[PDB]
A paper describes a structure:
[name], encoded by [name] and formerly known as [name], [name], [name], or [name], is specifically expressed on the basolateral membrane of hepatocytes. [name] plays a vital role in mediating the uptake of endogenous compounds such as bile acids, bilirubin, steroid conjugates, and thyroid hormones, as well as a large variety of clinical drugs including statins, antibiotics, antivirals, and anticancer medications for hepatic clearance. The interface between NTD and CTD of [name] forms a conserved cavity in which substrates bind.
Compared to lipophilic estrone and estradiol, the estrogen ester and conjugate, E3S, is unable to permeate through cell membranes and is transported mainly via OATPs, which has been widely used as a prototypical model substrate of [name].43–45 Inhibitors of OATPs are of interest in treating estrogen-associated cancers. In our study, the cryo-EM structures of [name]–E unexpectedly revealed three different conformations: inward-open state with high resolution, outward-open and occluded states with moderate to low resolutions. After extensive trials, we successfully obtained the inward-open structure of [name]–Ein at a resolution of 3.2 Å, with [name]–Eou and [name]–Eoc resolved at moderate to low resolutions. Densities of E3S were found in all three conformations at similar sites. The EM density of E3S in [name]–Ein is unambiguously resolved, allowing us to discern the pose of the E3S with high confidence. The inward-open structure of [name]–Ein opens its central substrate cavity towards the cytoplasm. F356 forms hydrophobic packing with the estrone group of E3S, together with Y352 and F386, enclosing the hydrophobic body of E3S. Additionally, residues from the minor pocket, Y625, Y422, Q541 and N544 form hydrogen-bond interactions with the sulfate group of E3S. In the inward-open [name]–Ein, accompanying the disappearance of the intracellular gate, an extracellular gate is generated by electrostatic interactions between NTD and CTD.
Residue numbers in the entry: 26 to 122, 138 to 149, 160 to 281, 324 to 652
Write the structure that this text describes.
Amino acid sequence: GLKMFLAALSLSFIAKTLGAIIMKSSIIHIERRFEISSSLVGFIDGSFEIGNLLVIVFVSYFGSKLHRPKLIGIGCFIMGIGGVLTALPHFFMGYYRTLSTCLINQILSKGCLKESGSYMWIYVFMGNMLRGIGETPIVPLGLSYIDDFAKEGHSSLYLGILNAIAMIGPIIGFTLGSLFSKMYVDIGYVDLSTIRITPTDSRWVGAWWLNFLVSGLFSIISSIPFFFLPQGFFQSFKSILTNPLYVMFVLLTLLQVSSYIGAFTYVFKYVEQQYGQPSSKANILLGVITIPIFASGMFLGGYIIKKFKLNTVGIAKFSCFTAVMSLSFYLLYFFILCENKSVAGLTMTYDGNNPVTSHRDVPLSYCNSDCNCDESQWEPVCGNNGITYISPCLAGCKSSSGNKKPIVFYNCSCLEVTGLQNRNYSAHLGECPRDDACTRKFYFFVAIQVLNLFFSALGGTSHVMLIVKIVQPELKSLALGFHSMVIRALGGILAPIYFGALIDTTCIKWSTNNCGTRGSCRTYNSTSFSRVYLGLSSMLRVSSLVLYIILIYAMKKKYQ
Ligand SMILES: *[C@@H]1O[C@H](CO)[C@@H](O[C@@H]2O[C@H](CO)[C@@H](O)[C@H](O)[C@H]2NC(C)=O)[C@H](O)[C@H]1NC(C)=O
Ligand SMILES: C[C@]12CC[C@H]3c4ccc(OS(=O)(=O)O)cc4CC[C@@H]3[C@@H]1CCC2=O
Ligand SMILES: *[C@@H]1O[C@H](CO)[C@@H](O)[C@H](O)[C@H]1NC(C)=O
């Protein structure tokens, strides 16, 4: 009889997952467009959790479940509104808007402060918090209703089946995300034949608002069927944290999730700054190749735990095994890397021959000297030598071909290598793409990501199964609830934040905002991005592994 409820919940789970990706696939765009640092784009990303942590508290004191289906419905409806709200800042903000050649010819010749636009991110941040306030009722209350209507061995298995179908969402999310990150932000408003920036450039902000509008409409449509369907605490918390093992595990999980959440939030920016790949490719490769294998990994983990008869002391050893395997593959990321992009004036002297300690305050070279011009304009042009430059004026170029589609500057004062004197010094817009070898290494990156995430998923269910055998039977609901709350809150709100702070400390060139304020990051120090990204994710992981080993030792003792 209750097939209706299951269908509806599946729609909702598909909707929930679609929502989460639409947020993490638009990070590279929202950040790029509202012009905020990586830290805030982490804050905005976390606000979703921030809302989740809010709704929890409000129900805990002065709230409770009542008529589950209508509640799930109002939750999904609020999630959809929130998606629509998050898309809304685009319709009342304005158009998302340097080719100046050398001006040796001419030499020695308030509103921005009051920029509400500067706190316009506060809109998206709110919308995401709405989404968080609305999503929370889905999972726990849906599982409660299931367990209310379930025969022997049904509610839990139902979680499994629903989780499987949910994996159809990330597939569409990334697929749609790959489609809308190729469409310029003002698509339909501006004639797309004049926009010079390309999807590979670092100023390209794709249609994120389409992502959010589609996610919101899907969420509302999935909220529709839920209507017309049905017709002390602290004391235990004390105990749950009194059990040393539980504490070890929650800490163990928190460490890994923070390594997962940071990596997910900034994987698109890492793909783009290390290898030359845009966001559209990354999105679709994660959606077509990685997600089916991730679902296969989750299924295989469940089956391995269900068939091989792995007990408590054994399930922990198996999950640790998955981790050693995942970490091994992750630690391989450090051998499939790529040299730094030589951005004259940022990683080297302007003459392109001497490398310097600081990106900041690099003295102008003869070539980039008399040509006085801005020093905060990121209009990158790469020359025949293959070294990126900052701006056509900072490269000392004199003449331009014109607004014709291929814009090739000439007579550039820099690029004064003596080996190409007979050759020209033309430099076309954009940065120059990385050598083929790096594009090749991108595929090793995708393969290592696939294998890592497969071995990660292999231990997915094991986490829930363990969090229930490490704790006394009468504390389970509270123990798993506190686990989920700690993981979501801490990992979700803090990890996108400090990962972005450290990625910020790796940034080389920032862009002026409306009124003289660090805006967004135009180019990064790839190698440092790695040591701060791949590095913080590895230590968090290694530390998780280290505690597991300790946990296994202890479990091997407690039961023996
Ligand atoms: C780029 O430099 C070339 C070579 O100097 C310029 O071509 C010469 O321009 C000047 C003035 O017209 C004269 O030397 C000759 O008429 C041109 N022939 C050459 C090769 O000497 C060219 O005009 C410059 N283009 C700009 C404005 O960037
Ligand atoms: C598998 C996933 C899509 C992308 C995933 C990912 C991708 C790269 C990544 O970092 S990477 O260095 O391993 O590539 C971390 C993660 C963490 C989990 C994250 C999602 C969970 C649900 C989902 O559909
Ligand atoms: C330099 O540019 C000229 C056009 O001005 C082009 O004909 C030439 O092939 C380029 N390089 C060489 C080999 O001189």
